[PDB]
């Protein structure tokens, strides 16, 4: 069995910006989620081979994870905050699609999503 290539994290042709909202997304939002007790299933692309989840990438066609988001932020990949917020939302949605109601990992994703949304409320106004 085989994993797909990971999502791209660098593209020399893709425009980018440094903004106060993107800085907040790295320094506060990503940092807070990354340090949470429930971060570990989300800190890297799903390794479907090692985890013996051969159906994962049959079901999930837009994979996303916090490892990839962290690299996109640090590599100066993004033009805007909405791209990064979308990546977090894809990560949560994927978890709800692949797994079932009440599953361990769904409960974890729900707790991280609640925390994410709390931090997004304090997203600074753009300068
Ligand atoms: C079952 N469904 C999913 N499992 C995982 C996933 N990521 C893991 C990372 C690493 C470990 N290992 C840690 C080191 N140990 C030695 C051995 C296990 C397991 C992991 N799993 C499986 C698991 C199962 C239940 C709750 C959380 C995660 C991620 N997922 C996402 C994202 N969406 N759905 C899933």
């Amino acid at each position: 069995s085989m994993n797909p290539p990971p999502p791209e994290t660098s593209n020399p042709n893709k425009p980018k910006r440094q903004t106060n909202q993107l800085q907040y997304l790295l320094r506060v939002v990503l940092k807070t989620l990354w340090k949470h007790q429930f971060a570990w299933p989300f800190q890297q692309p799903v390794d479907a081979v090692k985890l013996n989840l051969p159906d994962y990438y049959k079901i999930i066609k837009t994979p996303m994870d916090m490892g990839t988001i962290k690299k996109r932020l640090e590599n100066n990949y993004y033009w805007n905050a909405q791209e990064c917020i979308q990546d977090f939302n894809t990560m949560f949605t994927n978890c709800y699609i692949y797994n079932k109601p009440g599953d361990d990992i769904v409960l974890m994703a729900e707790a991280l999503e609640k925390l994410f949304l709390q931090k997004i409320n304090e997203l600074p106004t753009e300068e």
Side-chain angles (χ1 to χ4, degrees):
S1 77
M2 294 172 66
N3 286 316
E8 65 172 41
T9 50
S10 180
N11 180 335
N13 293 303
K14 181 180 187 299
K16 79 291 305 307
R17 293 191 299 176
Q18 288 185 64
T19 76
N20 69 303
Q21 293 183 341
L22 281 165
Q23 285 179 223
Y24 179 90
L25 284 156
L26 177 59
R27 301 189 188 179
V28 176
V29 181
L30 179 66
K31 186 171 184 186
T32 297
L33 273 64
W34 190 272
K35 297 181 166 302
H36 191 280
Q37 182 180 134
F38 297 163
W40 56 277
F42 306 97
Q43 286 174 325
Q44 62 286 311
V46 170
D47 186 338
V49 176
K50 186 173 207 291
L51 297 175
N52 194 25
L53 303 173
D55 58 338
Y56 185 80
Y57 294 108
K58 305 185 189 185
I59 298 300
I60 298 306
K61 302 302 195 180
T62 308
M64 189 49 58
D65 67 277
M66 296 198 294
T68 296
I69 293 165
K70 179 177 172 302
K71 288 186 185 286
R72 286 180 174 196
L73 288 160
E74 294 177 341
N75 291 343
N76 221 350
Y77 179 82
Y78 297 120
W79 186 260
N80 68 38
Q82 184 245 281
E83 288 176 274
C84 178
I85 289 166
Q86 179 62 69
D87 285 344
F88 280 101
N89 284 329
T90 294
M91 178 181 81
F92 298 127
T93 302
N94 288 346
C95 187
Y96 305 148
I97 291 168
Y98 179 67
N99 304 280
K100 291 185 170 131
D103 285 357
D104 297 313
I105 198 173
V106 169
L107 295 167
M108 293 169 78
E110 292 169 332
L112 293 169
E113 182 178 16
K114 179 170 169 182
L115 180 56
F116 171 75
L117 292 170
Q118 292 167 333
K119 302 305 195 180
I120 298 295
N121 274 8
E122 294 149 44
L123 186 74
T125 310
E126 193 160 32
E127 291 176 11

